[PDB]
Write an enzyme that holds these catalytic residues in place. Structure first.
Site, PDB file in Angstrom:
ATOM      1  N   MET A  31     -13.345 -71.841-105.803  1.00  0.00           N
ATOM      2  CA  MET A  31     -13.153 -73.264-105.912  1.00  0.00           C
ATOM      3  C   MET A  31     -14.494 -73.888-106.223  1.00  0.00           C
ATOM      4  SD  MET A  31     -10.479 -74.571-103.171  1.00  0.00           S
ATOM      5  CE  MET A  31     -11.048 -73.640-101.756  1.00  0.00           C
ATOM      6  N   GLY A  32     -15.377 -73.076-106.798  1.00  0.00           N
ATOM      7  CA  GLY A  32     -16.739 -73.522-107.117  1.00  0.00           C
ATOM      8  C   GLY A  32     -17.619 -73.701-105.884  1.00  0.00           C
TER       9      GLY A  32
ATOM     10  N   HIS B 141     -21.843 -69.721-103.533  1.00  0.00           N
ATOM     11  CA  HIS B 141     -22.844 -69.317-102.562  1.00  0.00           C
ATOM     12  C   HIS B 141     -23.006 -67.809-102.605  1.00  0.00           C
ATOM     13  CE1 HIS B 141     -19.004 -69.344-100.191  1.00  0.00           C
ATOM     14  NE2 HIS B 141     -19.439 -68.121 -99.948  1.00  0.00           N
TER      15      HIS B 141
ATOM     16  N   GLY C 159     -21.890 -65.395-100.991  1.00  0.00           N
ATOM     17  CA  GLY C 159     -20.597 -64.720-100.858  1.00  0.00           C
ATOM     18  C   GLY C 159     -19.868 -64.575-102.188  1.00  0.00           C
ATOM     19  N   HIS C 160     -19.972 -65.578-103.047  1.00  0.00           N
ATOM     20  CA  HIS C 160     -19.434 -65.480-104.415  1.00  0.00           C
ATOM     21  C   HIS C 160     -20.252 -64.520-105.278  1.00  0.00           C
ATOM     22  CE1 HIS C 160     -17.932 -69.519-103.064  1.00  0.00           C
ATOM     23  NE2 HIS C 160     -16.817 -68.871-103.351  1.00  0.00           N
TER      24      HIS C 160
ATOM     25  N   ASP D 207     -24.815 -76.514-111.977  1.00  0.00           N
ATOM     26  CA  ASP D 207     -25.433 -75.520-111.115  1.00  0.00           C
ATOM     27  C   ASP D 207     -24.659 -74.202-110.993  1.00  0.00           C
ATOM     28  OD1 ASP D 207     -26.679 -74.392-108.494  1.00  0.00           O
ATOM     29  OD2 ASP D 207     -24.532 -74.766-108.041  1.00  0.00           O
ATOM     30  N   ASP D 208     -23.351 -74.316-110.782  1.00  0.00           N
ATOM     31  CA  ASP D 208     -22.462 -73.154-110.668  1.00  0.00           C
ATOM     32  C   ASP D 208     -22.598 -72.294-111.897  1.00  0.00           C
ATOM     33  OD1 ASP D 208     -21.425 -74.068-108.157  1.00  0.00           O
ATOM     34  OD2 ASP D 208     -19.546 -74.770-109.118  1.00  0.00           O
TER      35      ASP D 208
ATOM     36  N   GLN E 109     -25.771 -70.558-111.981  1.00  0.00           N
ATOM     37  CA  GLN E 109     -25.739 -69.357-111.127  1.00  0.00           C
ATOM     38  C   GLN E 109     -25.031 -68.159-111.813  1.00  0.00           C
ATOM     39  OE1 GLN E 109     -25.551 -69.149-106.798  1.00  0.00           O
ATOM     40  NE2 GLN E 109     -24.954 -71.333-106.860  1.00  0.00           N
TER      41      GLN E 109
ATOM     42  N   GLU F 274     -13.554 -60.900 -97.511  1.00  0.00           N
ATOM     43  CA  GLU F 274     -12.687 -60.515 -96.375  1.00  0.00           C
ATOM     44  C   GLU F 274     -12.636 -61.592 -95.312  1.00  0.00           C
ATOM     45  OE1 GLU F 274     -14.104 -56.772 -94.927  1.00  0.00           O
ATOM     46  OE2 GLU F 274     -12.680 -55.663 -96.104  1.00  0.00           O
ATOM     47  N   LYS F 275     -13.433 -62.662 -95.452  1.00  0.00           N
ATOM     48  CA  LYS F 275     -13.495 -63.726 -94.387  1.00  0.00           C
ATOM     49  C   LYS F 275     -12.171 -64.338 -94.170  1.00  0.00           C
ATOM     50  CE  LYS F 275     -14.420 -68.010 -92.880  1.00  0.00           C
ATOM     51  NZ  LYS F 275     -13.416 -68.509 -93.927  1.00  0.00           N
TER      52      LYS F 275
ATOM     53  N   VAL G 197     -20.100 -61.722 -96.532  1.00  0.00           N
ATOM     54  CA  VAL G 197     -21.511 -61.940 -96.525  1.00  0.00           C
ATOM     55  C   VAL G 197     -21.771 -62.901 -95.334  1.00  0.00           C
ATOM     56  CG1 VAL G 197     -23.403 -63.137 -97.799  1.00  0.00           C
ATOM     57  CG2 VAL G 197     -21.937 -61.448 -99.007  1.00  0.00           C
TER      58      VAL G 197
ATOM     59  N   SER H 274     -19.853 -69.666 -95.097  1.00  0.00           N
ATOM     60  CA  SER H 274     -18.802 -70.624 -95.262  1.00  0.00           C
ATOM     61  C   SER H 274     -19.377 -71.940 -95.809  1.00  0.00           C
ATOM     62  CB  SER H 274     -18.111 -70.838 -93.926  1.00  0.00           C
ATOM     63  OG  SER H 274     -17.170 -71.881 -94.015  1.00  0.00           O
ATOM     64  N   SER H 275     -18.579 -72.653 -96.596  1.00  0.00           N
ATOM     65  CA  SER H 275     -19.071 -73.906 -97.146  1.00  0.00           C
ATOM     66  C   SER H 275     -19.070 -74.949 -96.016  1.00  0.00           C
ATOM     67  CB  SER H 275     -18.250 -74.351 -98.358  1.00  0.00           C
ATOM     68  OG  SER H 275     -16.942 -74.687 -97.968  1.00  0.00           O
ATOM     69  N   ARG H 276     -18.331 -74.685 -94.947  1.00  0.00           N
ATOM     70  CA  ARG H 276     -18.361 -75.590 -93.773  1.00  0.00           C
ATOM     71  C   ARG H 276     -19.644 -75.505 -92.900  1.00  0.00           C
ATOM     72  NH1 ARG H 276     -11.999 -75.006 -91.891  1.00  0.00           N
ATOM     73  NH2 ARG H 276     -11.264 -76.885 -92.985  1.00  0.00           N
TER      74      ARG H 276
HETATM   75  C1  LIG Z   1      -7.229 -68.444-103.317  1.00  0.00           C
HETATM   76  O1  LIG Z   1      -8.341 -67.563-103.189  1.00  0.00           O
HETATM   77  C2  LIG Z   1      -9.508 -68.253-102.942  1.00  0.00           C
HETATM   78  C3  LIG Z   1     -10.659 -67.716-103.459  1.00  0.00           C
HETATM   79  C4  LIG Z   1     -11.900 -68.313-103.279  1.00  0.00           C
HETATM   80  C5  LIG Z   1     -12.001 -69.473-102.541  1.00  0.00           C
HETATM   81  S1  LIG Z   1     -13.628 -70.205-102.339  1.00  0.00           S
HETATM   82  O2  LIG Z   1     -13.376 -71.457-101.509  1.00  0.00           O
HETATM   83  O3  LIG Z   1     -14.326 -70.673-103.610  1.00  0.00           O
HETATM   84  N1  LIG Z   1     -14.648 -69.032-101.799  1.00  0.00           N
HETATM   85  C6  LIG Z   1     -14.628 -68.731-100.514  1.00  0.00           C
HETATM   86  O4  LIG Z   1     -13.792 -69.287 -99.807  1.00  0.00           O
HETATM   87  C7  LIG Z   1     -15.434 -67.723-100.027  1.00  0.00           C
HETATM   88  C8  LIG Z   1     -15.729 -66.563-100.674  1.00  0.00           C
HETATM   89  C9  LIG Z   1     -16.485 -65.799 -99.846  1.00  0.00           C
HETATM   90  C10 LIG Z   1     -17.045 -64.584 -99.978  1.00  0.00           C
HETATM   91  C11 LIG Z   1     -17.776 -63.981 -98.946  1.00  0.00           C
HETATM   92  O5  LIG Z   1     -18.361 -62.742 -99.004  1.00  0.00           O
HETATM   93  C12 LIG Z   1     -18.169 -61.867-100.109  1.00  0.00           C
HETATM   94  C13 LIG Z   1     -17.920 -64.698 -97.764  1.00  0.00           C
HETATM   95  C14 LIG Z   1     -17.315 -65.942 -97.666  1.00  0.00           C
HETATM   96  C15 LIG Z   1     -16.611 -66.475 -98.666  1.00  0.00           C
HETATM   97  N2  LIG Z   1     -15.980 -67.686 -98.771  1.00  0.00           N
HETATM   98  C16 LIG Z   1     -15.909 -68.609 -97.548  1.00  0.00           C
HETATM   99  C17 LIG Z   1     -16.073 -70.089 -97.821  1.00  0.00           C
HETATM  100  O6  LIG Z   1     -16.754 -70.379 -98.819  1.00  0.00           O
HETATM  101  O7  LIG Z   1     -15.575 -70.906 -97.001  1.00  0.00           O
HETATM  102  C18 LIG Z   1     -10.840 -70.025-101.983  1.00  0.00           C
HETATM  103  C19 LIG Z   1      -9.579 -69.423-102.172  1.00  0.00           C
END
Ligand SMILES: COc1ccc(S(=O)(=O)NC(=O)c2cc3cc(OC)ccc3n2CC(=O)O)cc1
Ligand SMILES: COc1ccc(S(=O)(=O)NC(=O)c2cc3cc(OC)ccc3n2CC(=O)O)cc1
Ligand SMILES: COc1ccc(S(=O)(=O)NC(=O)c2cc3cc(OC)ccc3n2CC(=O)O)cc1
Lengths: 272, 283
Positions: free
Chosen positions: A39-40, A43, A45-46, A72-73, A76, A143-144, A171, A180-182
């Site tokens: 969802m852009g 970070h 984790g992406h 920016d995205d 990256q 996997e979060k 990550v 987390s973006s939170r």
């Molecule tokens: C429907 O599938 C999705 C896929 C990606 C998203 S997102 O909001 O852009 N990305 C994330 O939620 C996310 C990816 C990610 C990867 C990680 O390690 C490899 C660790 C945390 C991650 N997040 C958590 C977050 O951003 O809240 C949201 C929903």
């Protein structure tokens, strides 16, 4: 005519038909298509999802960026050597508005589907569409969001989709806090207390030599030692999120409210 | 990938088998045509197959599967009569999955259709179209055809499948085939066999009513509808369920000059449906 694609450059498409044509042109030239949905607001984790996808010999990586209802995205992604960014509008994704949708199985009503009961219907609908637009060989998720990842495997299994789902280890920050973006919104006292989620889970995973109850009591003790951490659930399940078997592989999930921020974490657990 | 014998009828039970052959074929440049059926094949299915056959370098896959999820024990099954006709038509693949292979986890993830699915045939059958769209999605994903063929008889079903395909960005062309009729105009159906001789004679009323409305329509919608009602009313033992005139997408839009007239009626225990394209006033 196939839309223009320049190998080893960042190629940005907004038209679903365009990315579909390019992905097909690529698939026919040998390349293995890898999908990273986002969802852009990218970070680390992406970037870990991107590096996983980039490792596959002959890969072209598609990163989608779509907020399911910047400069920016893209920078990256370019710095990671990603060749395609798919960035459609809401109208392009939903030209007929909301109509046909995915109804998740019963797992969607449990755990996170308790506070958000139509969350997963939305998620599986958009994931199904992105899969059909891009037709990747593999699709990469962190996997979060474990329950979401399991519901996506069920989607893939149930509708006979021909795509491998790859879950990539979460990550984490230096102290274990799941990316987390939170996290940027936590005040320093909330941020210090949030560490209890991953500390509880890693305690559980090591306590689990002593059994399931000791794993859970260990996690709960750790959570009980944190102020302002309101635990919504703490649950040991099998890896598919059914009942935890007597002994064997499992997953421990927790969710908690810290002031206004809901945080999630989960871990692999092995019993005894 | 399994044996495929070209110019022969190859029967596959396992989804993985037909998926691999289909994929093998498309890479050789054959175009894959799917005719989904629930077995008990008649001349309407043969017309679906013949339409599929006329697509250049097509290989035709006919799937035969009685989906428990759209309902069942009563349904006509005649696989001996089914495969004989396919061989006779030169179909090269029959896909005949078991319930276990299609639903190993039971019903879990399903397709939720739009609001059209609660109208007309779906009114008193709330999950009926959810069952249909789920099986059709799964068949499309297993076979991955270039085009899939349906008769226009179950028109609401076809419209819902077009929605499915547009809404989930499926890479398949949907082809509707004009409904094959008995020589009096009775729409081909598996359910016709359940008509006693009285009922079969009376059943001509649905198509008569529809053709009547279609020519009545120069005088407008009410005249078209009134002509259809009169034909149905004049018919012995025909109990009308609905008789409805809609836009061609059947959907959240009135009617323009052109649309679809749909009728469902009961003859004793047998429910019959039919429909026709209708042009109102000019056209
Ligand atoms: C429907 O599938 C999705 C896929 C990606 C998203 S997102 O909001 O852009 N990305 C994330 O939620 C996310 C990816 C990610 C990867 C990680 O390690 C490899 C660790 C945390 C991650 N997040 C958590 C977050 O951003 O809240 C949201 C929903
Ligand atoms: C057979 O001669 C070749 C084969 C491959 C190359 S290349 O430098 O690896 N570029 C491509 O292969 C390529 C270009 C290209 C353009 C497209 O839309 C305009 C779509 C795919 C394309 N490819 C395949 C690729 O990038 O691997 C250049 C020449
Ligand atoms: C889920 O999508 C499907 C597709 C086909 C079937 S079916 O039961 O095997 N066939 C039909 O319902 C059918 C096909 C057909 C073709 C026609 O002329 C081209 C005319 C009528 C047709 N039927 C009507 C019927 O058999 O009741 C049932 C469900």
């Amino acid at each position: 005519a196939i839309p223009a694609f320049h190998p080893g450059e960042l190629n940005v498409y907004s038209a679903p038909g365009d990315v579909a044509d390019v992905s097909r042109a690529l698939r026919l030239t040998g390349r293995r298509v890898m999908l990273v949905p986002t969802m852009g607001a990218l970070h680390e984790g992406h970037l870990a999802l991107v590096r996983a996808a980039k490792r596959v010999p002959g890969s072209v990586v598609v990163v989608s960026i779509f907020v399911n209802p910047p400069d920016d995205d893209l920078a990256q992604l370019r710095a990671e050597g990603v060749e395609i960014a798919f960035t459609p509008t809401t109208a392009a994704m939903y030209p007929d508005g909301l109509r046909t949708t995915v109804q998740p199985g019963p797992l969607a009503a449990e755990l996170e589907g308790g506070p958000r009961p139509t969350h997963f219907a939305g998620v599986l609908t958009v994931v199904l569409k992105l899969l059909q637009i891009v037709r990747p060989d593999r699709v990469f998720f962190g996997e979060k969001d474990y329950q979401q990842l399991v519901l996506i495997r069920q989607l893939v299994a149930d509708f006979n989709l021909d795509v491998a789902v790859v879950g990539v280890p979460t990550v984490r920050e230096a102290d274990g806090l799941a990316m987390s973006s939170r996290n940027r919104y936590l005040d320093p006292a909330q941020r210090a207390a949030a560490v209890a989620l991953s500390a509880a889970l890693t305690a559980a995973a090591h306590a689990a030599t002593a059994g399931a109850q000791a794993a859970l009591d260990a996690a709960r003790a750790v959570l009980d030692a944190a102020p302002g951490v309101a635990v919504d659930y703490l649950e040991l399940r099998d890896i598919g999120l059914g009942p935890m078997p007597l002994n064997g592989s499992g997953r421990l999930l927790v969710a908690a409210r810290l002031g206004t921020t809901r945080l999630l974490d989960n871990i692999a657990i092995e019993i005894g």
